[PDB]
Design a protein around this ligand. Structure first.
Ligand SMILES: Nc1ncnc2c1ncn2[C@@H]1O[C@H](COP(=O)(O)OP(=O)(O)OP(=O)(O)O)[C@@H](O)[C@H]1O
Ligand SMILES: Nc1ncnc2c1ncn2[C@@H]1O[C@H](COP(=O)(O)OP(=O)(O)OP(=O)(O)O)[C@@H](O)[C@H]1O
Ligand SMILES: O=c1nc2[nH][nH]cc-2c(=O)[nH]1
Ligand SMILES: [Ca+2]
Ligand SMILES: [Zn+2]
Ligand SMILES: [Zn+2]
Lengths: 694, 146, 49, 48
């Protein structure tokens, strides 16, 4: 593995048909027999590991102990028609058969799987690199064919990306993707987060912030993967382990609890449909269920208690599952604004940014980066700004002790961590907690869950408050959420047009009060009339209440104007009211709703077409890649896969800096400097070597 | 087949075969596809309408029960909102179909301690149910056409 | 897919489809690794014929 | 109609240079090429 790593280092910054790569191919040909022996060693055991799991092999397996005789192995393996006679003999020799010629194939198959994995992967990477940079040497297809099983095996873990390298050219980078990372990336919650992020950027983003946003998304996704791993499941100590088990259980099943709460609310309301009010006991009235079974009254109480408990558990699961991401994002943005911008060192936001003003409480806290990974942000801020703005002033701003830095660099102290609740008491950072709780209480999802809490509790004071939980279907169902977004999309327009309607109705009210007061008698009685327009307020209520709701406007309600000196004036009044108010303005409202529907649909279509037509990384359209068949599909699956950039970032984070290669160190440095010039923009490997590849 | 055979049991089952024009004529088929295109949205918005009408029914039962006397008789009243189920039927049956919402059907609130509350009830019912939601349905159909 | 399981071992599975040797091809492709007799039972074939 | 007019104006501004008429696709071969072109090379405020 070390020698192959040296060879791969020789291939750094290597162009297509480069002379070092051609020399490497000539070397491999010069040692063709030994290279074939190595490849046959790897593929034999890769094939063995999958043969031992075959039902055909299990048919030959007969010993109850789980062993197989050498002769049975011999007659089973040649039945597969995958090995030659000498290879079967070699496998028999490598099998640690006992004196009874019994083989433990379970350990035999797994014996070399782990030791040979890293070297197998590096051989695969080497062959892939050489094949892609010397595409016209037929002597190498033989090696690729001999390594076909190895390459197929390591295909899910061989990650490749392209960068704009140190040499002002597009370079292809090969690296490793782990099973755990891939499995976590395949989780449905992560896939939903990816779809939402892609939609946000492509819809309401510019071409300039795209890569910064993508990298921020990658960092957030890494943190979410960590949270998922933590909550995943395979007297103070006992209570603590049970508490974390319970908290993980709530976190894992947060959505099932949410659905259970909705189902319980529906059941409660269905019971509530049977309510009845009567004067007689079951001058004020009594409310009581009216059913024959006699079990609905106990069922309602049981469901109310269960629903309140489920809501509480939903609150806990949310603050154990999402709040960490909320605090992480907030700490990360605050730290980067402190360092790369000097938010509270230079500019000092002007009291109109409630977020920036609230973040001032956390700066001097001992534990400001609690969720964010960087525990040295304060040291970096001091080293960057202290000379010009005052080291002691910065230290007071960030709550640092200038004396402690030297001793911390000097040596490490190992104090006594007494596991006592009394000792844990003072250890609470109250200012940090106040800041965190303010951030949580200013979160929409948490506020909604708390409102759910409050209404569930009020349901015990009066069971009809459980009707409010029926509104949960809007957030529970993506279909309802889209439909209601089709209303909220033009909410400012709707409120403004309702206000305009109020104003126009007021103008009509003024006209009616001044001139048409006779016609607003809504009393069939002859001696006591009910005049609706002897007052501004009464007339305006009458108009906004009956005229707007009437099909034909106010003329439907007020008296006939026929045979009056003001007949024509009143008919113009009525027709204009009907047209401006009933027809035009209500048409405006309905049109705003329909236009919001169309706008949402065309946004979705635009995002989809953009994804299916341009590469998310380099921006080159599918038309260029499609010259080669399936060119865009291969480009978005292999060459410029964004999942691969995410995986590469994870890989760099995990890997030791002393072990970074040149390209990895380059990308890592430009990542830490927040410089995204390594992302290929408007250029790709295929374009750069159009001549040599074609 | 089955409806044609049942037409012999009762000849009015042959009326069902008049529905065949939708599949017989490409024009009808396109027009009805313009409805089925957003069928999930239509069903979901009808469900949301049912929920909002239920909320209004709860409010009316708790507070505005006096106004739901639909009997012109003076000694035997017909109260439509002395029960959850009766009131909810009344709302979903007459309030949705009325041009001005439920206020067109229930009694006048003038000269009552709850006049302003009831007028807000009526105007909001008219706006959310009669205007906005029916507009949503018609907009789904028009958007499917486009 | 669950309903298609009823047709595999039928004598006349490719009745309309033109390929009357699909079972032979499936056997020649998978029988070595998964068991020729098992595949023959799955597809309702007689290995002797 | 009003909404699509606004969208058309915005997309035109974000896709072509107001002065020379060359599209953002040409300038984007270089990273942030269109942004630099509209801030430094062909800024209309600079012509004013
Ligand atoms: N750099 C890129 N990386 C990945 N996908 C990209 C990239 N650029 C464009 N795309 C497009 O993004 C699309 C989204 O792919 P994805 O597999 O997530 O979608 P999908 O078809 O909904 O998924 P699936 O059917 O597997 O659930 C791809 O079809 C691809 O054309
Ligand atoms: N010659 C040009 N000069 C300036 N802008 C141009 C030119 N050609 C095209 N544009 C585009 O005009 C757009 C308008 O820029 P401007 O800063 O006025 O908009 P904005 O994003 O609304 O402003 P701000 O956020 O600073 O208030 C730019 O984003 C740019 O892409
Ligand atoms: O440099 C990083 N270090 C990290 N640690 N945990 C997540 C990290 C990240 O995104 N970047
Ligand atoms: Ca090193
Ligand atoms: Zn690309
Ligand atoms: Zn220009």
């Amino acid at each position: 593995k070390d020698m192959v790593v040296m060879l791969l280092s020789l291939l750094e910054g290597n162009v297509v048909n480069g002379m070092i790569a051609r020399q490497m191919v000539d070397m491999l040909v010069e040692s063709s027999s030994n290279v074939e022996m190595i490849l046959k060693f790897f593929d034999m055991f890769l094939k063995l590991k999958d043969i031992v799991g075959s039902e055909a092999f299990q048919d030959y397996v007969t010993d109850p102990r789980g062993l197989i005789s050498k002769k049975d192995f011999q007659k089973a393996m040649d039945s597969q028609k995958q090995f030659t006679g000498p290879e079967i003999q070699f496998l028999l020799s490598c099998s640690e058969a006992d004196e009874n010629e019994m083989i433990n194939f379970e350990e035999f198959a797994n014996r070399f799987q782990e030791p040979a994995r890293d070297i197998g992967f590096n051989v695969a990477v080497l062959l892939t690199n050489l094949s892609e940079h010397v595409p016209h040497d037929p002597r190498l297809r033989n090696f690729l064919e001999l390594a076909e099983s190895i390459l197929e095996y390591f295909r899910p873990y061989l990650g490749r990306i392209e960068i704009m390298g140190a040499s002002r050219r597009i370079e292809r980078i090969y690296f490793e993707i782990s099973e755990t990372n891939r499995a976590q990336w395949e989780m449905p919650q992560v896939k939903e987060s990816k779809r939402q992020f892609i939609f946000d950027v492509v819809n309401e983003g510019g071409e300039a912030e795209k890569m910064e946003l993508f990298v921020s998304f990658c960092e957030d996704t890494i943190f979410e993967m960590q949270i998922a791993a933590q909550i995943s499941e395979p007297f103070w100590g006992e209570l603590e382990v049970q508490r974390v088990k319970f908290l993980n259980y709530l976190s894992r099943n947060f959505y099932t609890l949410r659905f259970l709460a909705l189902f319980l609310a529906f059941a409660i309301n269905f019971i509530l449909l049977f309510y009845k009010v009567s004067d007689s006991p079951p001058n004020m009235v009594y409310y009581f269920l009216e059913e024959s079974t006699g079990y609905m009254e106990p069922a309602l109480w049981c469901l109310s208690l269960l629903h309140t408990l489920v809501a509480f558990l939903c609150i806990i699961g949310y603050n154990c599952l999402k709040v960490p991401l909320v605090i992480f994002k907030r700490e990360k943005e605050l730290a980067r604004k402190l360092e790369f911008d000097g938010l509270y060192i230079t500019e000092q936001p002007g009291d109109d940014d409630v977020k920036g003003q609230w973040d001032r409480l956390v700066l001097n806290t001992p534990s400001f980066p609690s969720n964010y990974w960087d525990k040295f942000v304060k040291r970096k801020v001091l080293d960057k700004h202290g000379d010009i703005f005052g080291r002691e002033r910065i230290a007071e701003l960030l709550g640092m002790d200038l004396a402690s830095l030297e001793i911390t660099a000097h040596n490490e102290r190992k104090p006594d961590p007494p596991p006592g609740l009394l000792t844990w008491l003072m250890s609470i950072d109250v200012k940090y907690q106040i800041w965190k709780f303010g951030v949580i209480f200013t979160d929409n999802s948490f506020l909604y869950l708390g409102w759910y809490m409050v209404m569930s509790l009020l349901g015990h004071y009066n069971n009809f408050f459980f009707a409010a939980h029926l509104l949960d279907i809007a957030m529970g169902v993506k279909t309802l959420r889209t439909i209601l977004s089709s209303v909220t999309h033009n909410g400012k327009q709707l409120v403004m047009t309702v206000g305009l309607l109020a104003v126009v109705v007021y103008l009509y009210t003024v006209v009616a009060f001044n001139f048409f007061r006779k016609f607003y008698n809504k009393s069939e009685d002859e001696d006591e009339p009910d005049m609706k327009c002897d007052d501004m307020m009464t007339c305006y209520l009458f108009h906004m209440y009956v005229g707007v709701r009437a099909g034909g406007g106010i003329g439907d309600e007020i008296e006939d104007p026929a045979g009056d000196e003001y007949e024509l004036y009143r008919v113009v009044f009525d027709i204009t009211f009907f047209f401006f108010v009933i027809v035009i303005l209500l048409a405006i409202i309905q049109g705003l709703i329909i236009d919001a529907f169309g706008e949402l649909r065309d946004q979705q279509e635009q995002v989809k077409e953009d994804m299916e037509t341009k590469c998310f990384i380099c921006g080159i359209g599918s038309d260029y890649f499609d010259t080669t068949p399936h060119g865009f599909e291969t480009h978005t699956l292999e060459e410029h896969n964004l999942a691969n950039y995410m995986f590469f970032l994870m890989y760099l984070i995990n890997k030791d800096e002393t072990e970074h290669t040149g390209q990895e160190s380059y990308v890592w440095k430009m990542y830490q400097e927040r410089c995204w010039d390594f992302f290929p923009a408007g250029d790709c490997f295929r374009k750069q070597y159009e001549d040599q590849l074609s």
